[model samples]
Target: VPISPIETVPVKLKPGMDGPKVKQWPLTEEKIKALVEICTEMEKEGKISKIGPENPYNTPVFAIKKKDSTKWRKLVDFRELNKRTQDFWEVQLGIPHPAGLKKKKSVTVLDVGDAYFSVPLDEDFRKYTAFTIPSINNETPGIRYQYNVLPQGWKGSPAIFQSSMTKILEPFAAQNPDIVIYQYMDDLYVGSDLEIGQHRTKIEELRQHLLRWGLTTPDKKHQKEPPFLWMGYELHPDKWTVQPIVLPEKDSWTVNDIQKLVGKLNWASQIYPGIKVRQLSKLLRGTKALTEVIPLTEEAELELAENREILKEPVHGVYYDPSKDLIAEIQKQGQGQWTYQIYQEPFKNLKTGKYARMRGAHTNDVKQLTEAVQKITTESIVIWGKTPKFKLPIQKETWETWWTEYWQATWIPEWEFVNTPPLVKLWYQLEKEPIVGAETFYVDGAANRETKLGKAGYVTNKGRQKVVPLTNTTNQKTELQAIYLALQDSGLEVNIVTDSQYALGIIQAQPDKSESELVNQIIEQLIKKEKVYLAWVPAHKGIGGNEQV
Candidate 1:
């Protein structure tokens, strides 16, 4: 039997359904002529028949993506046609890829040309693929054409085509299990531990069987051998690792290029192991040029190249962590001499805790939160130059995206309820008395002719508070400093007494404002704790603390 011309599977519309008559988009003279010519050609080839307006189903078609050197493609608008077709969601190519090709000697893959177009439309159902194209050029003409084979852009074309192919291919597979009949939508693949020559012969056998199955034309049978170079990993047999990547020569790397390379590395590292997207994030920041700047510094490119070498070591056994509840995976790189380069994954936190870091300034918030506060230590470091330095404790400021401090209040599943006596605090109900000792803080801002300085002093519980200077400055900025300072020392019923009522108002609403980066952060901290507040101290008042600062 010979292969038939193209056709679509019977479309069953819903009962009492009336599909809308979708309209055609206007096409220019050139595109309309292109369409007329293509339609004339397809019509002459008997791929479609001229239909009448007595036709009820009229989906539209228009011009779509065209090549630099060519005419427009006649893309049919199947908006209404798709509505009438019963959705078949369970369609799959249904070919399982064989794992462990170590046993296979040679491989051969088949490329099916115009695979779906091979099945012709049955005589009764040609009207659904029908649509009319108009003539912009009065020179030639325009006519209506209905598709005889599978129509592109129709909702279920691929699935229907796959369903069509399976009838023949499945039986062929059962007859010859030695050959892998992998149908990727249309093209079929066959693999074996047989010789390369033998593989070719066997693939040819499968091809001939497909042709004899009488569904596709001989012209539709095209084959591509090895050295195909799929996407990026290329093709290899019997190896778990996917490798061989890219790099830049001159200093002409754009910040975009850095980002693109980073993405590729991030993915490859996971499957290959020992790959991390850490310190590399720091390269762009702290530089003079703004974010997204390109032609990356020559030194920076070298920095990336040096880091890229780290991925040269393959990672094995990379898999998801079924152990942790959160959506994070842990994969190890090398066992020995590869020293633990323990670094935090960016934008992640185990819980919410008040800690922020400047470059090299990230918290020992983990330690400080676990231990006592004065017992905190943070460090800041740089690799390009001289000796590194440390500040107080584990808090650094080189921030990228803020750590969300992954803490949402949750109850322990293992804890059992214990029945016990109700404990009470007598001081809480003691006459609604308020503590008169404002042993906290009072702040003021001093803006000189050129420099802006903020002075905030806090009195400790031991009558021991320190006066501090803040770098981020100005009227609005100083208010932020004073408030941040007050919140920073929060322990008891801390009250932030500020003389600048105007500043405090601005801080409350200025969230998400241009200069509100720090302000927004302060608000996040505010959401976590409610014991903190700002008290407006009157100006020129006899209050000694407000007057002195």
Candidate 2:
């Protein structure tokens, strides 16, 4: 179960090369403990080879806390190894799309868990992924571990995973001609005109195929309806928008954080070409380490604030329907910038009709403009300006497939003629839970780390109490189970109290997020009730009802 039945192309190395034999990085005591736990877990799960002190090829490994949490994620420094490996660009079967999910009535997403590891590595290439961890006592020539499956932090991992996943789903896609599916690496977005339930069934069928190939699905697996976050953008039937990027408190800005923001701004610049990130780019120049906090100049701060405002607006994208008159406008805005946007309008007489421009962006120079043109993927395009005097290196072979031209604008767009309507930001929100008061129930859950067993119990002031045991689950899951049970067994009008802040947060999280099955069940129970209140009570604080459970 740890590896896939599908054999991926081995990590190819250049001829006349073995691999790097890098040294282990030093770690703090806490990180060392986490590293040991990770190695043991993966070894037990058959995800890695047995630990030993010998391997011709080794990479330094370390653990870092996951975003906004205390959990550690294993990371192996593979820069040296990747250098020796053959760069197989031609083997990539899928490419990421900048436009995001296609506009559709309904959309569902499938995220393959541990996507790379599911790909079984050939015996010869496994040595290339070997990594070492320093012993707790700092022993010389520390314990070395190698991956049995494809490892992360490798350059070719994405390409191999994409090719294998596409091969796995190719037949399924061919059979379901009506449904539209877009695969960006492990994230598969499904769009269809079918109703919500039918869409769920179709995605479930696709998920089963992934499982059959030894790939796994995590608890946060399904976002079954539209208005969900796919890739980095929030998608809706009417528009797609990027999450607003707000600067952190002035003092706490790290180089890594700014670098990440710049990366996002670079992507956003694709849609809103007017956003000026040149000032922000200067801050990144001469930066030493990513984690080091760097002082921001006043001009850079002002530019970032302005960029945030532009990122907040929604950019609507319509499918390129060939039946409609598709207009591609490439206008040079002064000598400094060139703007490009595509519009789909009804075929009509130019004298009476006007343009209805859709999504577009502006690039600062000719080189950036040429790069943006490649993303303008459409079958046919009507240019809306004088043809560029300078040549654009348009990927003629690439654009011919499913991915455009210049024309002079004769009239103002219809949107410009009338007072432009304020664009409504499209997204989803659950109906606010009504306030209620009734018989109160206090619930609590506990898990034994040694045995990996969990249990939940709940007590009501009216002498109703029940306890249930859970096997092979975590404390957080148990906490969720207790709350779910309290809601299920209580009367229609009741307030439930729990001691876990983690559980409370999940219960109140925003709609369209992928969730565990247990969390889904808890939400379902909450939705079914007419009047229910969820409140968090502190644990072991000597409160009457809280002590009973």
Candidate 3:
């Protein structure tokens, strides 16, 4: 006789059958293992592929004992078995219902419906903690202790359910690619533009798939076209396009829940254009009293009052109080005015013949000034007659000669020389007898006198040595000059050090085209000698020689 697939196999009574004895079940371990191996071989051969493992045998096991009884009775290990294990008892494998083929139009609307879970109760006659009633009783004891029915600790719950359902409806999805299917828990929605026959066919296919899975689809709850509830929103195809699918009655709104509703409205606004801020505002007005009311301060109230006067207008038969307009008006009023002025006065004093203007022009004696002014203002030299006292314009050549002589004799001679005898002596010594072994040196530049031109020097092991002062040079240039001096003094091959990386980087780049000028000239001179190198020393790393120098 062929083995009965659904029949239970009894366990023989033995003395030493240790541990907890599992309840008798149809599918034995040997049978299940053989079936699994067959499925694996089939997969490897590419003959047929099982959707996934679904063991009802491993569903859930419980041990219960009567209040007065001493021994515990074992329930079947349903937790270890999948629900599909009963398929062995089924007469024939059901064919998938094809979703009706339909054309996608210009405007494709997807309608999702409310989905929830229904859990089976245990032997206690109490509704499964997973499927207990949604918190209706405020004072219900242990209400917080209940567990939700949706996917929890089961490792393969999501994949198994998704695969099984997808397989059952595979033919329908394959037929109608345009029809989108969205499922949450057991709630499923199939949407398309097809109105009459096509829509009905799709629903029929979906219903068949549900029946195959031992699931029921409620006709009253099912909706077509628009005005469907999905993810807590009531979505209508026409005027009320997107609305949240909330419970029939709820006590209060959570901040997060309200935020979610706001996000949906925002998305709807983007899709429908101006529906969110406009339509949602109207809808929200109805709940304004129930919602959290924030009372305005005195200043805020005054500002709102002013704004109402400015932006008060009827929009879609509803009046909205403007908050920003009044504040802007107040700001403008507070900010008063800007003042500017211009002053004009004589550069020279007419009475005392002294310079009066803070800037520009010098003054001359009254007699000479008047004559010169008259000579320029009048066409001829004799304006008021009696011989003009103003001197005539000097020759250009004579003026140039006199200016050059004056600069050399007066300006050049009077200016103090910045270079001292010590600096000059060092330069001579470097030329005569160059010292070796000195690579890095600390060089600094400072203004000697009131003149902006400054003197520079390098501190070496020998002592402080000065160099020629450079006019209108930066600190970096002075540092480079010191490096050059050190290299020149040290005849043998050596490195020249400095405190600044910036100076070293400048010398390293050495972009100057004129090799005979500035630092560039010094670098070229050192390169020709082939006895010196320049390097940067980090400021304060405790290198005694570098730090002291």
Candidate 4:
């Protein structure tokens, strides 16, 4: 008999189609050829009967449901056919089953929506075929049909979508070399810990890039915190919570959801010691009445009991080992006197092997416990000033002699020596004048060196630029004057920058208090003109421009 066609139902094409139709069997000549080869190999290996009615569990064929609510249908029975097929073809064409199943690390789970891409219609197909094939058979005119085919359950669909999405993000990834972009389907997760500002900037950049590629992200579902949703789990820094979203809403869990949640909880428990497995079960119990299903499993009871014991243990206490040799050493060293005085005289050992001495009361008991412990317990503990026989190590010297020696060697001579310039004699001034305008003038300043007989300008800057010099004979007055002269020369609308911390203090201080006459004059002049505004700039970090003078 002629070999039965491997495809029981032939897929229908819309019009002169080159590939399988939508919602139809994918079987073609090539697919049948591969199936036949697989069957032949299975027969040679004495496993040809696996696909037959003999083996119930070992059936070599299986089916998958289509995307458009289609009923399940068989594909091919390769298991039994593998023995009959040639070794080379079986090795080449067969889809290998997963081995040593492991949890996928860093899996990207993308939830894609329907109609991701558009397809052309049958009318367009006819027009193309009419022009391309004029002598086509009228009865069975295989007119070429063109349609925008959306990616769906096709074998190559995943690869196509993945590659396309990756291509769109390629430029973004290149621009942001620091961020790691992982994708699954339409979902994209970008990760980086380079400061909040940097991360926000990068995320904005990514959003702009995706928008350019016709992909928009859902703002509500996008999470920026730990336990972030990705690949069917909530990923954290070190651990992962599978179905973390369920943890917050246990009331609406399905059977499959519960199973997956429980499986993840169990797996996590194994990985992390002392995991609150009982707490997880209690959370799940809020969803459905699970007590009716399995009651209390042995593992559940054991975990609950263990957790109860943990809760009962005291969380805070001072533990002491009376049997340790250190206690005897402390006693022999006359430290016992210091200890006894701190803890009250009457020493009694408690059932917990802890000793307490109560001379006045529990509060005064310091013989059995140290002062530190007494303070922690908020109790008074008596402590001796010193033990006569046990003197602490020290060096001795008379107070007056030591003071005199120290002053001569370190302090007195330095205070008397005036090697620096006469900074107090300098005078400072400030002003403002416009650079290119006759109407408005910028604020300016200059510092003048005034001695008993004469006055000379010491330091100056053209305008308000960050430059400050720390030198003698250049007090607040001279510094302000120097800034004023500098700004006047620059001929620009200027704001005087200075390290006039003292000047600002005088301005802010109580006006009734007696102030320096020169400072009072400058302040009055500045207020009267309203042209110069004294602003304080930080001193001594190389940032000062005009102030450096």
Candidate 5:
């Protein structure tokens, strides 16, 4: 098919911008074959063309499996190219929310064939799209390829394509205002609230209009009824509702599997709003490699089960009614995570007398929740609904409780949670003088190298002793923990001794220098004491308190 009538557009480069030709990375035999096949096919279709080595611009090329299909799509690693190019300032419109499409009598969806290729690229900009494909033999230089059309991976491609598509359909859309057309990039959903017949007729008319501009949609890609799939959402026009795209079933999982699990759920969250994925945080962290197999821990297994149960039914996705009052509630999930739940005012059915309420629980991350709060506030004002006022208040007592629980649950990375100021007991005061003979506690921490087991023990002069066992920890942290355990609730004037100079130095040093949570707590405990002394005793010297504890 010929390119659309849209005028060819150049990818503007920043003034005086220049970059080195990036060498192509080695690809597996299978990947090489896939890349060659795709490049050859696009060349024949006049969407891409072979370029000579004389072209100054070059970037790596790779392939990714197309979503929900076995086919692979070619993409250029355009990161370097984008860095040197000027950004197109034209703002692109985002897809409409499912709520806006409510009351549609019927709907049809269209996926434009070769979406980016529908727009022809300017001859001058073709050089900027140059990418190298690996030669079959290692010794030979790679072959160069460049897009004749606007390349898929280029930064400005989407905005340009979206702009052209919108312009092409604007006249048709204006003629039939009753037929609502929702578009995202190449995907279009055509619908009408009037009747199914009107919606069907308009879908045909729209397709014909697109054909006149040299754009084509596959016959199979057009669905003529409700329950049309749009942007990974199952849209049901008859009932004015939407559901999840798909529920994938699996026994064993790779990183890709877990990613897709979250991806699909997150997509649904746009319509459904609040859903919890806190249990999968650990699984979600670490590796960036998608195909690598991850061992399923107990928490991961339980999370999968929870996800399956949640997907068993369609979400309550009716459009928000103006008359209904909206409410937002915050819930603490497990220890470290806080999630928000949005609900509408409760009402009973007039005839059936059944009570119901619409609600969704959103992200547990504080930063994300803060954004959600702001967005919801703005949206309420625009929709003429009363803004839901919420206050997120924190107290020393509350944080101490949350910290203790969160610490016990996992030794999380420092970046994951906020560290509150050193907690001070309100009524704590120091006595003027210490007693001549005060009770003393000696603490020691030990770890086995081979077993990766650590233990922290503290014993008092009066024979009272406490031992805490830990796993996947080092002796330094254990040593700090022992001091915390020893001074935890000693109300009277006392003396605490530990052989670990590292732990003692940490507590006595500046607060910011103390990285471990145990050290922070030890500082807090010291503030609660009326009078106390810290002594660093030598290790393995047969000191009775140190030897025993």
Candidate 6:
């Protein structure tokens, strides 16, 4: 069923009390009639009341067209009304997510409804949610409706709904300790490894108690037992299982994309094992990652697409990454080469012709990743941890309470350090090296959009300093400028110092086809590694050169 939450926080209008009424798209007669009908029924039931002449707030209403349905859903534009409103911050009952499923021999499902709408509002603030809609019964042009119960578009709706959901499920979970239970908003799942009769009895009592409290699993489609389901998954009742979340595909995404993906990981990490988020976590974390449009480089894109393959449910195809399904196929075949890729025939060829790719990027990134696949004989090969020493897939243990705990906490094969009399000396780097330097030149970039400002700072031998304002960008242009400023006629090997890994990594590597002329120029001067050694200095730390920049 669809989500329903209750009372809304009073909106802080756009310009406060003095702002004009929010402008909105005109509604059709059918849409307007629907709104009037809902309001009239709610008013009859005393859930809402007509607005008053002195009402300080007036929020526009609109129709939302949902998936698989044509009826326009009416909701107040509480967003505009809440121009100054923010989310509610409070300590609340921790709503259990996958909470790592507890293995059970049998399963039952229950849904809770009237989520937000069933919740009551503070009597004093009831009028704060008031909004105007076209009227039918009043013989008036418009009628005002003030929520006695919550309404949609309220900032605190989810939190409020979740609060109630937690309270309602707490006792059920407590009393049925033998039964493993979990919830996602309104969705509830109960499972048990106990005797079937006791399990059935526990479920009946739980159902009876909920109804006695006048609560309902509001969703009409809820069933007694339909195979097995939990948090929107069909699963084995006897195993602790963790599944993935899939997002709608897009040509490209920004922080929002990262946010949705991270949200899923957060839930999985809470209930399962073996998801260690390192650099990617650092890359996507915090203030800047949210708003900036960071491109996914080939290495980064391949890295994420593989994780998306592992964590995000399918159904979202190439939108997540074109190669994911093929990767799964490779795992199944077990005779894989390095990386078997999903190919979209550039010339529409014999193996395959059409495939989906991100709007512009990751097209060639995916292509390059699977280049080895093209060289190999056809649809083949995959393995996650064959334990470099053992050369075989790790074994999954016997059934237990924890989900993948064995795979996470302990080790598999350890042999590389296993010593024989002699060995060939070898060197290893975890990843590709893009920056190298021996000489020292401290450089950095900066930009302030609000002031339309940019700067590139340079430092030289004996603390000689030079500052040049850049054309526009901060990170890249600044470092490039510092390198340009440092280029000297002397044949001595020099060090290039800067904080931007992006800038440093690209020096010896390729320039993005759309890279700046400055980047090309830096590359030109840098292949003179005969004289320049690229060295990376951590940014914003206490080093003198870094501080100077």
Predictions in order: lDDT: 0.49, 0.62, 0.35, 0.34, 0.63, 0.49
At residue 185, what lDDT does model 1 achieve?
66
lDDT of 6: 0.49
Worst 10-residue lDDT window for candidate 5 reads: 349-358
Per-residue alpha-carbon lDDT of candidate 2 for residues 85-113, written as tens digits (9 for 90 to 100)? 88866543434442322456677667788
Expressed as tens digits, the lDDT of each residue in 1-549 for candidate 5 is 575567776667788987537877677878889988988888888888887777467788777887887778766778888788788866544545554334555666787877888788878877877888887766677767787887777778887887788888889978987777777767876667766666667777788888888788767746445556554556554333354457676777788777877767655554443344555546766577767777778876786576667666765454544555455444334333344434453431100000111122211223333444565565545443456544332344643543453323322111112233222122233333444477777888887777778888888878788888989888787887787788874545777788888876655432321334565576567666667777777888867555543
Per-residue alpha-carbon lDDT of candidate 4 for residues 1-549, written as tens digits (9 for 90 to 100) = 111111111122234333222211233444334444544443343322222212112212224456884333334332232232222211123211111011222322223333133111122221211101111223332112111222233333344455556666677777778667656455666656467677766676777665555455545654455555544444545333334222223334444555665555453331122334543355454555543433445665565455445334322111122232111101211111111111111131110111222232112111222332333122211111211111111112222232343223321110111122211110222332322322222222334455312111323243223333333344555544444343444322334445557545554331211224444454444434424444566656546433222
Give candidate 5's total backbone clashes: 3
Off by over 4 Å in 2: 25-33, 51-55, 66-70, 90-102, 133-144, 218-221, 230-232, 242-317, 329-341, 346-549
The C-alpha stretches of model 1 lying farther than 4 A from their native spots are 1-46, 57-103, 120-126, 133-142, 194-201, 214-223, 237-244, 248-259, 267-276, 279-303, 307-549
Q: Best-fitting candidate, measured by TM-score?
A: 2
Model 5, residue 527: distance off in Å is: 16
Could you tell me every candidate's TM-score relative to the true structure? Answer: 0.50, 0.51, 0.25, 0.27, 0.50, 0.44
Better of 3 and 4 by TM-score: 4
Candidate 5, superposed: residue stretches over 4 Å from native: 1-5, 10-102, 111-158, 172-179, 195-212, 216-222, 238-276, 283-295, 312-316, 322-325, 343-549
Off by over 4 Å in 6: 1-25, 64-72, 90-99, 135-141, 171-174, 218-234, 239-549
User: Which structure is stronger by lDDT: 2 or 3?
Assistant: 2
Candidate 3 or 1, higher TM-score: 1
Q: In model 2, state the lDDT of residue 277.
A: 58
**lDDT of candidate 3 over 238-354, digit per residue (tens):** 222224222122344443434454454343321121221222132343453554643334543343244334323311111111221100000001111101111111221001111
Best-to-worst ranking by lDDT: 5, 2, 1, 6, 3, 4
Compute the lDDT of residue 524 as modeled in candidate 4.
Answer: 42
